[PDB]
């Protein structure tokens, strides 16, 4: 016997995001499904969904003080303020991005409260999980922008164009770090005319990136003595002088972003050479970039993008509304409140239980 | 004057399994039939029987700047395939078939010559090449409103229809020599 | 007279990033036997070093020296006055001149007894088709139109599939399908979006068809002036095509005139939340009733960005094209190293604005009357 569910969505406050956690058609399934949902006034106004939408979808439009009031599922984009957790009842579960390197006092807050937190960044990277990996969906995202950000910033033509006034030979564009985000940055950068390069580490990724028809960047070989890292490094800064364009992408969870883009490799990009650092958010894989802004420098113009999903908040929002609908196959059973503990992707996502921090490195980062 | 030699896909079938080297000239027409992907794939199937094949692009070809390299990119042709003229130019009396895909005004030898509108066009010289088999689907004039005798050249043949469906029957008739 | 000596100033115009001629352009007219000048500079904008000029026979010089004993001046916009002021006797202005924009600088090169080519005036003839510059700056404006356009929206272009779920394609409106419009729809299909074509002419629509797009079938033949009644007939239900859209590119100027409203007020209202609209006629006036000309702006959800100077946002493209546009005329004005202008040639005879103070066109006459 299970409480029959009532899940909420708040409207978004963190600085520039535009994203809402469910949309009004993913509303409309749950609500069929038989579960009540309650939205935030103005939630998804990010997203250009409005409230009279949502109501149209079956869900309570409400003032966010009323929110929280007889809700099993807190469903955030980003963790939700201090507000909202001290409206956390007994028994609820947030559910959305947490990242505690981020937002640690946000995370202490939810402890000394007690709550119960699934970290939608805690998805376990495996196959039968894909549908809910909000990671992957919000790099499809932000890859898609990269490539098109790239041909903004770049004074030269992507495509080959033969013209009466000469003929335009492609962009030589190379994706660095060919994770999810990388990948899309392929396909884009494709779809517009480029010559693409890609460059990674393992051997899969290049693979896939050969699949797209991109070019691999193949090093010298592939610890290694210092001559050979200097080998190494010297004729990777050799692929990287003769492109146009460098989208760099390369995040390791819970540290900082790599440098790939030192300086003595930098001073060999021609004049209009441009940089998409898609890790700016964690520091960056480019030394000269300036998280969330433009910079020019030897007319080498470098932008390291925060917040690309919320660009993009329409499909941010729906996939990201998926993710967490078919996450919810392990909250709901026919309208019932009914979590899976035992589940494998709950396991790995439990960030904590009634204040129980069970993340180890969390844990560690809040001692 | 000379005359239009109309040609069977079968006959260009035959043409074309045993050239060495073969020119791909798409024009306008290739672009309103949309036969780009058809043509990639006679030009996968000639380089998978050990032709030698390339791309001729005229830099007006088509009605708007690089029009047939947008169409060619999308189809997946590889950017070293594609030539311009003063690369491919010199090359083409080596050339043992030309195969001109809804293309007219930019192989009309009549540019040469001070009357016709066309002068002051550089052209591209189909017409040095061993043989010429054009694609169009009858008697439609180009952009100038002009007749082109390249047409009615000896070493000329006519393969007339919509270029996507030629193109799928030419190769249908080569997977089966 | 001489050995012809061509000189290429530093742009000034607000947001002007090309330059008339590049290295690797002016080395061939170095090599066919003309001295260049550059100004100081001249090249950065396009990411062409005062060295890199050098390197291609160029003197780089300050911009009082540009004109002495210059007799071709090649520019982008219309040379302001101080240049003005310094042109020798026979030498040609050759460069766009916009008399509409810039009636007071063709007032003065006129009071000068100048003599002036304007590129926008090249005829549409065989001929002159490697000398077009407003083909060439358009092919730039309509790719960065697709680009910003999928820049500024909340939605993706292509039609995407994954263990989320399936995506639909943008519905992408290009209004007005001359060279930008072709080239702005040909790149929005190739990053998938769903394209469709309005323009009145039959053939115009040929064209969007030859890449993949849809022509928008109005209920009226546009092809004659229309009745008050078949004008709300055809208004109807292209506002009805203009509803179900994301994405509205708009791209019809006329020479010398206000750009005409596409999009009037009505239409814009049936726009979605999270429309977007990149309205590329905001240099004359825009066709969107919302278009601030340089910005973007947001009413009811609907974006709307007038962007001015695309050309030099792509500024090595763009002064790469346009500087083979120069070269490819200056056949005209060159013969084996000497200043040797075709008065006679009919490409020559179309485009000289203005010949040692006479005005030659018409309409610019009118105009500085
Ligand atoms: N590229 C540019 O930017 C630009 C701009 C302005 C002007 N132009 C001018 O446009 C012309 C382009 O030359 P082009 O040789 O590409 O084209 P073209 O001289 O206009 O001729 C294209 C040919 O396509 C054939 N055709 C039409 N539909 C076809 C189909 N479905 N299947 C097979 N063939 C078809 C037509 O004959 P049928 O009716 O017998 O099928 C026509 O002869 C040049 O004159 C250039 O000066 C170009
Ligand atoms: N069996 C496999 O193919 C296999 C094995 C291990 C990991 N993975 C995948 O790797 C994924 C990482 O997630 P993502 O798609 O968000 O990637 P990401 O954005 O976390 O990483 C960016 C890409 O950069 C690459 N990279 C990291 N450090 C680099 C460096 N120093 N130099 C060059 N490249 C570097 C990584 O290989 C990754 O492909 C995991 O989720 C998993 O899906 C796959």
Redesign the interface.
């Known amino acids: 016997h299970h409480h029959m569910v009532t899940v909420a969505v708040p409207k978004e406050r963190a600085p520039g995001e535009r994203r809402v956690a469910l949309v009004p058609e993913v509303v409309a399934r749950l609500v069929k499904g038989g579960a009540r949902v309650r939205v935030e006034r103005g939630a998804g106004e990010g997203?250009?969904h409005?409230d009279e939408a949502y109501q149209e979808a079956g869900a309570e439009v409400v003032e966010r003080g009323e929110l929280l009031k007889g809700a099993h599922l807190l469903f955030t984009v980003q963790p939700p303020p201090e507000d909202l957790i001290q409206a956390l009842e007994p028994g609820a579960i947030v559910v959305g991005f947490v990242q505690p390197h981020k937002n640690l006092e946000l995370v202490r807050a939810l402890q000394a409260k007690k709550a119960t937190v699934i970290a939608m960044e805690l998805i376990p990277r495996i196959t039968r999980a894909?549908?809910m990996?909000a990671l992957?969906?919000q790099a499809?995202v932000a890859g898609?922008?990269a490539a098109?950000?790239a041909?903004?910033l770049?004074?030269?033509?992507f495509?080959?164009?033969?013209?009466?006034?000469?003929?335009?030979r492609?962009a030589k564009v190379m994706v660095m770090g060919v994770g999810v985000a990388g990948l899309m940055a392929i396909a884009?950068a494709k779809?517009?005319?480029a010559?693409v390069f890609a460059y990674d580490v393992r051997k899969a990724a290049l693979e896939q990136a050969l699949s797209l028809?991109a070019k691999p960047i193949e090093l010298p070989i592939s610890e290694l003595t210092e001559e050979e890292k200097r080998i190494q490094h010297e004729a990777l800064r050799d692929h990287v002088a003769g492109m146009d364009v460098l989208i760099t992408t390369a995040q390791v969870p819970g540290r900082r972003a790599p440098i790939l883009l030192t300086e003595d490799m930098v001073e060999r990009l021609?004049?209009?050479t441009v940089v998409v650092d898609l890790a700016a958010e964690s520091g960056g894989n480019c030394v000269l970039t300036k998280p969330g802004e433009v910079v020019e420098v030897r007319?080498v113009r470098v932008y390291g993008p925060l917040n690309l999903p919320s660009?993009?908040?329409?499909?941010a929002s729906?996939?990201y509304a998926?993710?967490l609908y078919?996450l919810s196959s392990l909250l709901i059973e026919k309208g019932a409140f009914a979590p899976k503990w035992e589940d494998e992707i709950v396991r790995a996502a439990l960030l904590m239980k009634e204040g129980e921090v069970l993340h180890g490195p969390t844990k560690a980062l809040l001692g | 004057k000379g005359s239009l030699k109309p040609i069977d896909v079968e006959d260009a079938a035959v043409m074309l399994a045993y050239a060495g080297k073969v020119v791909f000239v798409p024009g306008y027409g290739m672009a309103l039939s949309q036969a780009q992907h058809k043509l990639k794939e006679l030009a996968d199937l000639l380089e998978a029987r050990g032709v030698e094949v390339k791309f001729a692009i005229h830099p007006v070809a088509g009605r708007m700047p690089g029009h047939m390299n947008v169409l060619l990119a999308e189809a997946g042709v590889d950017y070293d395939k594609l030539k311009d003229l003063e690369e491919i130019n010199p090359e083409f009396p080596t050339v043992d078939v030309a195969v001109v895909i809804g293309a007219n005004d930019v192989v009309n030898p009549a540019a040469r010559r001070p009357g016709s509108p066309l002068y002051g066009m550089p052209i591209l010289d189909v017409d040095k090449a061993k043989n010429v088999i054009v694609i169009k689907r009858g008697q439609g004039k180009g952009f100038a409103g002009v007749e082109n005798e390249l047409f009615y050249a000896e070493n000329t043949r006519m393969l007339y229809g919509d270029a996507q469906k030629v193109l799928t029957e030419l190769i249908q008739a080569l997977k089966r020599l």
Do not use: C, W
């Open positions: 997203a250009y409005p894909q549908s990996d992957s969906s499809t898609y922008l098109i950000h041909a903004r770049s004074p030269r033509f495509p080959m164009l033969t013209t009466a006034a000469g003929t335009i492609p884009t779809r517009l005319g010559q028809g021609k004049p209009g007319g660009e993009l908040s329409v499909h729906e996939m998926k993710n078919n």
